[PDB]
Amino acid sequence: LPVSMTKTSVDCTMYICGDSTECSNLLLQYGSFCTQLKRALTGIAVEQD
Amino acid sequence: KNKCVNFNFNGLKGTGVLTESNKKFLPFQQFGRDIADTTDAVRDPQTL
Amino acid sequence: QKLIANQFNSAIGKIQDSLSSTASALGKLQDVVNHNAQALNTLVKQLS
Ligand SMILES: *[C@@H]1O[C@H](CO)[C@@H](O)[C@H](O)[C@H]1NC(C)=O
Protein backbone atom coordinates (compact mmCIF):
# COMPACT_ATOMS: atom_id res chain seq x y z
CA LEU A 1 0.00 0.00 0.00
CA PRO A 2 1.51 3.39 -0.92
CA VAL A 3 1.57 5.88 1.94
CA SER A 4 3.25 9.10 0.73
CA MET A 5 4.50 10.99 -2.32
CA THR A 6 7.60 13.04 -3.02
CA LYS A 7 7.36 16.52 -1.50
CA THR A 8 7.81 18.95 -4.41
CA SER A 9 8.50 22.68 -4.18
CA VAL A 10 8.14 24.93 -7.23
CA ASP A 11 9.69 28.39 -7.56
CA CYS A 12 7.54 30.46 -9.93
CA THR A 13 10.05 33.09 -10.99
CA MET A 14 12.76 30.55 -11.85
CA TYR A 15 10.34 28.48 -13.95
CA ILE A 16 8.26 31.12 -15.75
CA CYS A 17 10.90 33.85 -16.06
CA GLY A 18 14.24 32.21 -15.31
CA ASP A 19 16.85 34.97 -15.14
CA SER A 20 14.72 37.58 -16.96
CA THR A 21 14.20 40.56 -14.66
CA GLU A 22 11.66 42.15 -17.01
CA CYS A 23 9.54 38.98 -16.99
CA SER A 24 9.70 38.95 -13.19
CA ASN A 25 8.45 42.55 -13.13
CA LEU A 26 5.65 41.65 -15.55
CA LEU A 27 4.71 38.52 -13.59
CA LEU A 28 3.76 40.64 -10.56
CA GLN A 29 0.73 41.97 -12.47
CA TYR A 30 -0.94 38.53 -12.53
CA GLY A 31 -1.74 38.58 -8.81
CA SER A 32 -1.45 35.81 -6.22
CA PHE A 33 -1.35 32.83 -8.58
CA CYS A 34 2.01 31.75 -7.17
CA THR A 35 0.84 32.21 -3.58
CA GLN A 36 -1.96 29.72 -4.27
CA LEU A 37 0.46 27.36 -6.03
CA LYS A 38 3.00 27.36 -3.20
CA ARG A 39 0.27 27.07 -0.56
CA ALA A 40 -1.14 23.99 -2.29
CA LEU A 41 2.31 22.43 -2.66
CA THR A 42 3.08 23.11 1.01
CA GLY A 43 -0.25 21.58 2.01
CA ILE A 44 0.58 18.43 0.05
CA ALA A 45 4.05 18.37 1.63
CA VAL A 46 2.69 18.47 5.18
CA GLU A 47 -0.01 15.99 4.18
CA GLN A 48 2.64 13.43 3.21
CA ASP A 49 4.26 13.66 6.65
CA LYS B 1 35.19 33.03 -15.49
CA ASN B 2 34.03 31.34 -12.27
CA LYS B 3 31.75 34.26 -11.37
CA CYS B 4 28.03 34.95 -11.72
CA VAL B 5 28.06 37.47 -14.59
CA ASN B 6 25.77 38.72 -17.33
CA PHE B 7 26.98 37.30 -20.65
CA ASN B 8 26.11 37.97 -24.30
CA PHE B 9 27.52 35.37 -26.72
CA ASN B 10 26.51 36.47 -30.23
CA GLY B 11 23.17 37.70 -28.89
CA LEU B 12 22.69 34.81 -26.43
CA LYS B 13 21.97 36.89 -23.34
CA GLY B 14 21.75 35.35 -19.89
CA THR B 15 23.11 35.22 -16.36
CA GLY B 16 25.24 32.44 -14.92
CA VAL B 17 28.69 31.14 -14.04
CA LEU B 18 31.04 30.39 -16.94
CA THR B 19 33.36 27.45 -16.30
CA GLU B 20 35.93 25.62 -18.41
CA SER B 21 33.89 22.86 -20.02
CA ASN B 22 35.00 19.23 -20.13
CA LYS B 23 32.45 17.83 -22.62
CA LYS B 24 33.99 17.04 -26.01
CA PHE B 25 32.28 19.15 -28.63
CA LEU B 26 32.99 18.02 -32.15
CA PRO B 27 34.61 20.69 -34.35
CA PHE B 28 31.34 21.38 -36.19
CA GLN B 29 29.39 21.92 -32.95
CA GLN B 30 29.45 25.45 -31.50
CA PHE B 31 26.46 25.51 -29.11
CA GLY B 32 24.97 22.99 -26.68
CA ARG B 33 21.52 22.36 -25.23
CA ASP B 34 20.22 20.60 -22.13
CA ILE B 35 16.76 19.19 -21.45
CA ALA B 36 13.99 21.67 -22.33
CA ASP B 37 16.24 23.26 -25.00
CA THR B 38 18.11 25.35 -22.42
CA THR B 39 21.62 26.42 -23.40
CA ASP B 40 24.09 24.42 -21.29
CA ALA B 41 27.42 25.22 -22.99
CA VAL B 42 28.77 27.60 -25.63
CA ARG B 43 32.11 27.97 -27.40
CA ASP B 44 33.74 31.38 -27.24
CA PRO B 45 33.60 33.10 -30.66
CA GLN B 46 36.92 34.84 -29.93
CA THR B 47 38.97 31.79 -28.87
CA LEU B 48 36.63 28.85 -29.70
CA GLN C 1 2.36 -26.79 17.54
CA LYS C 2 5.46 -28.08 15.73
CA LEU C 3 3.60 -28.48 12.43
CA ILE C 4 2.12 -24.97 12.70
CA ALA C 5 5.53 -23.47 13.46
CA ASN C 6 7.09 -25.31 10.52
CA GLN C 7 4.30 -24.12 8.21
CA PHE C 8 4.79 -20.52 9.34
CA ASN C 9 8.56 -20.68 8.82
CA SER C 10 8.16 -22.27 5.38
CA ALA C 11 5.61 -19.62 4.41
CA ILE C 12 8.00 -16.85 5.47
CA GLY C 13 10.78 -18.44 3.43
CA LYS C 14 8.48 -18.70 0.41
CA ILE C 15 7.58 -15.03 0.93
CA GLN C 16 11.25 -14.08 0.77
CA ASP C 17 11.81 -16.25 -2.31
CA SER C 18 8.79 -14.79 -4.13
CA LEU C 19 9.86 -11.23 -3.32
CA SER C 20 13.39 -11.88 -4.57
CA SER C 21 12.32 -13.67 -7.75
CA THR C 22 9.43 -11.40 -8.80
CA ALA C 23 10.69 -7.89 -9.55
CA SER C 24 7.19 -6.70 -10.53
CA ALA C 25 5.62 -7.46 -7.14
CA LEU C 26 6.24 -3.89 -5.91
CA GLY C 27 4.90 -2.29 -9.10
CA LYS C 28 2.10 -0.61 -7.15
CA LEU C 29 4.77 1.27 -5.17
CA GLN C 30 7.01 2.11 -8.14
CA ASP C 31 3.95 3.53 -9.92
CA VAL C 32 3.76 6.59 -7.65
CA VAL C 33 7.45 7.39 -8.17
CA ASN C 34 7.10 6.92 -11.93
CA HIS C 35 4.04 9.18 -12.02
CA ASN C 36 5.76 11.93 -10.04
CA ALA C 37 8.87 11.72 -12.23
CA GLN C 38 6.75 11.83 -15.40
CA ALA C 39 4.83 14.85 -14.10
CA LEU C 40 8.07 16.69 -13.35
CA ASN C 41 9.51 15.74 -16.75
CA THR C 42 6.46 16.97 -18.66
CA LEU C 43 6.49 20.18 -16.61
CA VAL C 44 10.14 20.74 -17.58
CA LYS C 45 9.49 19.89 -21.24
CA GLN C 46 6.63 22.41 -21.37
CA LEU C 47 9.21 25.20 -21.11
CA SER C 48 10.25 24.48 -24.71
C1 LIG D 1 41.39 38.54 -33.27
O2 LIG D 1 41.84 39.77 -33.86
C3 LIG D 1 43.03 40.30 -33.27
C4 LIG D 1 43.31 41.62 -33.94
O5 LIG D 1 43.42 41.47 -35.35
C6 LIG D 1 44.18 39.30 -33.42
O7 LIG D 1 45.33 39.81 -32.76
C8 LIG D 1 43.79 37.95 -32.83
O9 LIG D 1 44.81 36.99 -33.09
C10 LIG D 1 42.47 37.47 -33.43
N11 LIG D 1 42.06 36.22 -32.82
C12 LIG D 1 41.35 35.29 -33.47
C13 LIG D 1 41.02 34.05 -32.69
O14 LIG D 1 40.99 35.43 -34.63
Output the DSSP codes for C1-48.
-HHHHHHHHHHHHHHHHHHHH-TTTTHHHHHHHHHHHHHHHHHHHTT-
| A35 phi/psi in degrees, rounded to 5 | -60, -45
Bridge partners of residue B17, in order along the sequence: B4
Chain B hits for C47, Cβ within 8 Å: 36-38
Residue B6, C-beta contacts closer than 8 angstroms, at least 6 positions apart: B13, B14, B15
What number of CA atoms fall less than 13 Å from residue A40's CA on the CB side? 8
CB contacts under 8 A, C 1-48 vs A, are 28-29, 31-33, 36, 40, 43, 47
Bridge partners of residue B4, in order along the sequence: B17
Chain C hits for A44, Cβ within 8 Å: none
Enter the resolution in angstroms. 2.7
Bridge partners of residue B6, in order along the sequence: B15
Residue A4, C-beta contacts closer than 8 angstroms, at least 6 positions apart: A48, A49
